Design an enzyme around this catalytic site. Structure first.
Site, PDB file in Angstrom:
ATOM      1  N   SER A 175       4.453  -6.333  -9.332  1.00  0.00           N
ATOM      2  CA  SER A 175       4.896  -7.745  -9.174  1.00  0.00           C
ATOM      3  C   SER A 175       4.703  -7.828  -7.479  1.00  0.00           C
ATOM      4  O   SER A 175       5.136  -9.057  -7.021  1.00  0.00           O
ATOM      5  CB  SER A 175       6.317  -7.935  -9.391  1.00  0.00           C
ATOM      6  N   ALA A 203      -5.207  -6.238  -5.029  1.00  0.00           N
ATOM      7  CA  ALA A 203      -6.379  -5.608  -5.206  1.00  0.00           C
ATOM      8  C   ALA A 203      -7.479  -5.877  -4.016  1.00  0.00           C
ATOM      9  O   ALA A 203      -7.685  -6.870  -3.642  1.00  0.00           O
ATOM     10  CB  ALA A 203      -6.969  -5.540  -6.464  1.00  0.00           C
ATOM     11  N   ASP A 204      -7.787  -4.593  -3.463  1.00  0.00           N
ATOM     12  CA  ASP A 204      -8.871  -4.882  -2.376  1.00  0.00           C
ATOM     13  C   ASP A 204     -10.059  -4.264  -2.890  1.00  0.00           C
ATOM     14  O   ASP A 204     -11.459  -4.591  -2.452  1.00  0.00           O
ATOM     15  CB  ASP A 204      -8.392  -4.094  -1.300  1.00  0.00           C
ATOM     16  N   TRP A 264       8.155   0.149 -16.799  1.00  0.00           N
ATOM     17  CA  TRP A 264       9.192   0.063 -15.929  1.00  0.00           C
ATOM     18  C   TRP A 264       8.563   0.074 -14.392  1.00  0.00           C
ATOM     19  O   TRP A 264       8.813  -0.464 -13.555  1.00  0.00           O
ATOM     20  CB  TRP A 264      10.332   0.928 -16.093  1.00  0.00           C
ATOM     21  N   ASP A 316       4.124  15.518  -3.326  1.00  0.00           N
ATOM     22  CA  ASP A 316       4.281  16.609  -2.425  1.00  0.00           C
ATOM     23  C   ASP A 316       3.616  16.349  -1.236  1.00  0.00           C
ATOM     24  O   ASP A 316       3.391  17.238  -0.374  1.00  0.00           O
ATOM     25  CB  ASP A 316       3.737  17.930  -3.181  1.00  0.00           C
ATOM     26  N   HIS A 352       0.108   7.412  -6.154  1.00  0.00           N
ATOM     27  CA  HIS A 352      -0.973   8.043  -6.103  1.00  0.00           C
ATOM     28  C   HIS A 352      -0.854   9.685  -5.586  1.00  0.00           C
ATOM     29  O   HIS A 352      -1.693  10.709  -5.847  1.00  0.00           O
ATOM     30  CB  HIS A 352      -2.068   7.295  -5.306  1.00  0.00           C
ATOM     31  N   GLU A 380       0.894  -1.267   0.041  1.00  0.00           N
ATOM     32  CA  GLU A 380       0.030   0.129   0.008  1.00  0.00           C
ATOM     33  C   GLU A 380       0.843   1.375   0.012  1.00  0.00           C
ATOM     34  O   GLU A 380       0.630   2.324  -0.808  1.00  0.00           O
ATOM     35  CB  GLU A 380      -0.962   0.082   1.367  1.00  0.00           C
ATOM     36  N   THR A 406       3.431 -14.076  -6.673  1.00  0.00           N
ATOM     37  CA  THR A 406       4.666 -13.960  -5.654  1.00  0.00           C
ATOM     38  C   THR A 406       4.574 -12.533  -5.259  1.00  0.00           C
ATOM     39  O   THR A 406       5.358 -11.754  -5.572  1.00  0.00           O
ATOM     40  CB  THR A 406       5.983 -14.145  -6.173  1.00  0.00           C
ATOM     41  N   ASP A 416       0.425 -11.051  -9.310  1.00  0.00           N
ATOM     42  CA  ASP A 416       1.425 -12.298  -9.746  1.00  0.00           C
ATOM     43  C   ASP A 416       1.398 -13.165  -8.479  1.00  0.00           C
ATOM     44  O   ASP A 416       0.654 -12.910  -7.468  1.00  0.00           O
ATOM     45  CB  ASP A 416       2.631 -11.999 -10.153  1.00  0.00           C
TER      46      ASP A 416
HETATM   47  C1  HEM Z   1      -0.350   2.462 -15.413  1.00  0.00           C
HETATM   48  C2  HEM Z   1      -1.274   2.817 -14.527  1.00  0.00           C
HETATM   49  C3  HEM Z   1      -1.766   1.894 -13.315  1.00  0.00           C
HETATM   50  C4  HEM Z   1      -3.001   1.530 -13.171  1.00  0.00           C
HETATM   51  C5  HEM Z   1      -4.174   1.717 -14.092  1.00  0.00           C
HETATM   52  C6  HEM Z   1      -2.933   0.919 -11.982  1.00  0.00           C
HETATM   53  C7  HEM Z   1      -4.193   0.433 -11.023  1.00  0.00           C
HETATM   54  C8  HEM Z   1      -4.112  -0.385  -9.910  1.00  0.00           C
HETATM   55  C9  HEM Z   1      -5.046  -1.126  -9.202  1.00  0.00           C
HETATM   56  C10 HEM Z   1      -6.826  -1.071  -9.672  1.00  0.00           C
HETATM   57  C11 HEM Z   1      -4.865  -1.497  -8.133  1.00  0.00           C
HETATM   58  C12 HEM Z   1      -5.536  -2.326  -7.063  1.00  0.00           C
HETATM   59  C13 HEM Z   1      -6.072  -1.291  -6.052  1.00  0.00           C
HETATM   60  C14 HEM Z   1      -7.024  -1.890  -5.181  1.00  0.00           C
HETATM   61  O1  HEM Z   1      -8.467  -2.516  -5.614  1.00  0.00           O
HETATM   62  O2  HEM Z   1      -6.750  -2.396  -3.838  1.00  0.00           O
HETATM   63  C15 HEM Z   1      -3.389  -1.066  -8.003  1.00  0.00           C
HETATM   64  C16 HEM Z   1      -2.615  -1.579  -6.940  1.00  0.00           C
HETATM   65  C17 HEM Z   1      -1.319  -1.245  -6.711  1.00  0.00           C
HETATM   66  N1  HEM Z   1      -0.430  -0.206  -7.471  1.00  0.00           N
HETATM   67 FE1  HEM Z   1      -1.002   0.178  -9.554  1.00  0.00          FE
HETATM   68  N2  HEM Z   1      -1.908   1.188 -11.170  1.00  0.00           N
HETATM   69  C18 HEM Z   1      -0.944   1.491 -11.991  1.00  0.00           C
HETATM   70  C19 HEM Z   1       0.350   2.233 -12.004  1.00  0.00           C
HETATM   71  C20 HEM Z   1       0.963   1.859 -10.752  1.00  0.00           C
HETATM   72  C21 HEM Z   1       2.288   2.367 -10.455  1.00  0.00           C
HETATM   73  C22 HEM Z   1       3.360   3.321 -11.746  1.00  0.00           C
HETATM   74  C23 HEM Z   1       2.843   2.030  -9.479  1.00  0.00           C
HETATM   75  C24 HEM Z   1       4.047   2.429  -8.690  1.00  0.00           C
HETATM   76  C25 HEM Z   1       4.241   2.808  -7.492  1.00  0.00           C
HETATM   77  C26 HEM Z   1       1.876   1.255  -8.824  1.00  0.00           C
HETATM   78  C27 HEM Z   1       1.739   0.703  -7.343  1.00  0.00           C
HETATM   79  C28 HEM Z   1       0.677   0.025  -6.988  1.00  0.00           C
HETATM   80  C29 HEM Z   1       0.919  -1.152  -5.912  1.00  0.00           C
HETATM   81  C30 HEM Z   1       2.064  -1.400  -5.059  1.00  0.00           C
HETATM   82  C31 HEM Z   1      -0.388  -1.762  -5.814  1.00  0.00           C
HETATM   83  C32 HEM Z   1      -0.835  -2.856  -4.803  1.00  0.00           C
HETATM   84  C33 HEM Z   1      -1.213  -2.343  -3.552  1.00  0.00           C
HETATM   85  C34 HEM Z   1      -1.610  -3.526  -2.376  1.00  0.00           C
HETATM   86  O3  HEM Z   1      -1.206  -4.575  -2.696  1.00  0.00           O
HETATM   87  O4  HEM Z   1      -2.334  -3.147  -1.505  1.00  0.00           O
HETATM   88  N3  HEM Z   1       0.985   1.160  -9.625  1.00  0.00           N
HETATM   89  N4  HEM Z   1      -3.091  -0.541  -9.060  1.00  0.00           N
HETATM   90  C1  LIG Z   2       1.037 -23.120  -7.809  1.00  0.00           C
HETATM   91  O1  LIG Z   2       1.881 -23.677  -7.334  1.00  0.00           O
HETATM   92  C2  LIG Z   2       2.843 -23.879  -8.577  1.00  0.00           C
HETATM   93  C3  LIG Z   2       4.071 -24.829  -8.054  1.00  0.00           C
HETATM   94  O2  LIG Z   2       3.710 -25.745  -7.153  1.00  0.00           O
HETATM   95  C4  LIG Z   2       3.242 -22.772  -9.057  1.00  0.00           C
HETATM   96  O3  LIG Z   2       3.834 -22.913 -10.558  1.00  0.00           O
HETATM   97  C5  LIG Z   2       2.245 -21.694  -9.348  1.00  0.00           C
HETATM   98  O4  LIG Z   2       2.619 -20.548  -9.448  1.00  0.00           O
HETATM   99  C6  LIG Z   2       1.253 -21.503  -7.922  1.00  0.00           C
HETATM  100  O5  LIG Z   2       2.451 -21.415  -6.899  1.00  0.00           O
HETATM  101  C7  LIG Z   2       1.786 -20.301  -6.114  1.00  0.00           C
HETATM  102  O6  LIG Z   2       1.319 -21.037  -4.994  1.00  0.00           O
HETATM  103  C8  LIG Z   2       2.407 -21.767  -4.244  1.00  0.00           C
HETATM  104  C9  LIG Z   2       2.061 -22.510  -2.949  1.00  0.00           C
HETATM  105  O7  LIG Z   2       1.285 -23.656  -3.574  1.00  0.00           O
HETATM  106  C10 LIG Z   2       3.671 -20.922  -3.925  1.00  0.00           C
HETATM  107  O8  LIG Z   2       4.645 -21.603  -3.462  1.00  0.00           O
HETATM  108  C11 LIG Z   2       3.825 -20.126  -5.159  1.00  0.00           C
HETATM  109  O9  LIG Z   2       4.888 -18.987  -4.613  1.00  0.00           O
HETATM  110  C12 LIG Z   2       2.867 -19.457  -5.699  1.00  0.00           C
HETATM  111  O10 LIG Z   2       2.390 -18.335  -4.964  1.00  0.00           O
HETATM  112 CA    CA Z   3       0.656  14.784  -4.727  1.00  0.00          CA
HETATM  113 CA    CA Z   4       6.053 -11.183  -7.601  1.00  0.00          CA
HETATM  114 MN    MN Z   5      -4.340  -3.195  -0.564  1.00  0.00          MN
END
Ligand code: HEM
Ligand SMILES: *[C@@H]1O[C@H](CO)[C@@H](O)[C@H](O)[C@@H]1O[C@H]1O[C@H](CO)[C@@H](O)[C@H](O)[C@@H]1O
Ligand code: CA
Ligand code: CA
Ligand code: MN
Ligand code: NAG
Ligand code: MAN
Ligand code: MAN
Ligand code: MAN
EC number: 1.11.1.16
Length: 331
Positions: free
Chosen positions: A170, A174-175, A164, A62, A47, A40, A189, A187
């Site tokens: 990675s 999403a919540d 980039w 800012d 944001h 987050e 991981t 993804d």
């Molecule tokens: C290209 C435009 C982008 C779009 C349309 C987008 C959209 C989204 C959406 C829909 C979520 C899920 C929010 C939720 O429902 O919880 C998300 C999560 C997130 N965004 Fe992106 N994003 C973009 C670019 C970026 C960029 C440039 C960053 C760099 C800091 C970023 C960082 C993150 C992170 C770290 C999460 C996960 C937050 C969590 O796991 O709680 N995003 N984004």
């Molecule tokens: C399911 O498991 C596969 C290997 O057993 C992976 O190829 C898939 O990505 C997926 O793995 C996910 O869940 C496992 C736990 O079963 C984690 O070890 C992986 O890191 C990944 O989250």
């Molecule tokens: Ca700002």
């Molecule tokens: Ca990952």
């Molecule tokens: Mn979240």
């Protein structure tokens, strides 16, 4: 210079950051983990800083999202961001640095807790926010590639730079996209800064992890994983396809570029020359864990080969049956 506690740093101003480092590792990030709060906080850098348009206004990186939190957390595209803002506000009260600095700092500390992550360069001394962001400056998951690329471009990012930055996904979940399944990662991981995201977003969809009728969600390849429609479009778009695939099994490129472009983002609406380099305060990240792979059960023919210049790299698949993706522990 040697700080009041023996820890060292190139510039002496940066010393003030050490108590804050500790505070947020202990009290913000569950003792230095790559989990929800880190994710987050990383999201929060964007944001905040993306709130920058030559056309509509905003001071970019800012701290406005905190300073003007009543306005900004109420934008649609900021849905859910209120949580991590109200979690950070107390730290900003407590410590003696601007909200703008803190957001970037926290996000930098956060990333560094993730295996395979990097030390995003960090500068100190952003003045207070002097205006809220306009609305309609945060890209939404249901916007068109053109719409998104133009928005990022308005802010100073070329198409390849958007790819980039989206390395961030990675380590992300999403919540709000599907509120029935909070914590659903992009993804397999969410706890590792790796290429899996660029890999898994290129697969043919199979299913929907929760409900199917969600704005801004594409079909996912894996149970327990959500796919943003935006990422789905960007991974396949002529302008970005080949950059997206270039990231696959390419950790040095993810690492170096992410870090460099994040640094640019953190300095939107700011003059680098009036700031102080404090990048050596950021902890040393752990090395990458795990290696690039197609998910278990998958193969090269699940890949949608969007890039025309180069073929998808000959990855091997994890052994065994199709497994599902465990959520991010939180809430
Ligand atoms: C290209 C435009 C982008 C779009 C349309 C987008 C959209 C989204 C959406 C829909 C979520 C899920 C929010 C939720 O429902 O919880 C998300 C999560 C997130 N965004 Fe992106 N994003 C973009 C670019 C970026 C960029 C440039 C960053 C760099 C800091 C970023 C960082 C993150 C992170 C770290 C999460 C996960 C937050 C969590 O796991 O709680 N995003 N984004
Ligand atoms: C399911 O498991 C596969 C290997 O057993 C992976 O190829 C898939 O990505 C997926 O793995 C996910 O869940 C496992 C736990 O079963 C984690 O070890 C992986 O890191 C990944 O989250
Ligand atoms: Ca700002
Ligand atoms: Ca990952
Ligand atoms: Mn979240
Ligand atoms: C609080 O931080 C600001 C900005 O670095 C500084 O100017 C001010 O002197 C600090 N207050 C004190 C005295 O701790
Ligand atoms: C094909 O495209 C790839 C990116 O996936 C490049 O690495 C290569 O130079 C060629 O243009
Ligand atoms: C991270 O920590 C390493 C040692 O563990 C240092 O070499 C580096 O300067 C950074 O602080
Ligand atoms: C796949 O299924 C596992 C358990 O079988 C869940 O923990 C995960 O959320 C995903 O839906």
């Amino acid at each position: 210079a040697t700080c009041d506690d023996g820890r060292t740093t190139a510039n002496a101003a940066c010393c003030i950051l050490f108590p804050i480092l500790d505070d947020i590792q202990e009290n913000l990030f569950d003792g230095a983990q790559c989990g929800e709060e880190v994710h987050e906080s990383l999201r929060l850098t964007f944001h905040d800083a993306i709130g920058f348009s030559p056309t509509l206004g905003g001071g970019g990186a800012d701290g406005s999202i905190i300073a003007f939190d009543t306005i900004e957390t109420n934008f649609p595209a900021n849905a859910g961001i209120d949580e991590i803002v109200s979690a950070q506000k107390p730290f900003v009260a407590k410590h003696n640095i601007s909200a703008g600095d803190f957001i970037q700092f926290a996000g930098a500390v956060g990333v560094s807790n993730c295996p395979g992550g990097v030390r995003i360069p960090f500068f100190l001394g952003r003045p207070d926010a002097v205006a809220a962001s306009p609305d309609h400056l945060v890209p939404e998951p249901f916007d068109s590639v053109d719409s998104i690329l133009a928005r990022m471009g308005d802010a100073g990012f070329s198409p390849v730079e958007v790819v980039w930055l989206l390395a961030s996904h990675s380590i992300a979940a999403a919540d709000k996209v599907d509120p029935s399944i909070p914590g659903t990662p992009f993804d397999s991981t969410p706890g590792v800064f790796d290429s899996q995201f660029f890999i898994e977003t290129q697969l043919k969809g199979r299913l929907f992890p929760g409900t199917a009728d969600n704005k801004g969600e594409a079909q996912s390849p894996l149970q327990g994983e959500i796919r943003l429609q935006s990422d789905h479009l960007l991974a396949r778009d002529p302008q970005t396809a080949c950059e997206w695939q270039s990231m696959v099994n390419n950790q040095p490129k993810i690492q170096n570029r992410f870090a460099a472009t994040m640094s640019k983002m953190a300095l939107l609406g700011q003059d680098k020359t009036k700031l102080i380099d404090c990048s050596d305060v950021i902890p040393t990240p752990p090395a990458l864990v795990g290696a690039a792979h197609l998910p278990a059960g998958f193969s090269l023919s699940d890949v949608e080969q969007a890039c025309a210049a180069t073929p998808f790299p000959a990855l091997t698949a994890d052994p065994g049956p199709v497994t599902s993706v465990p959520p991010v522990p939180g809430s």
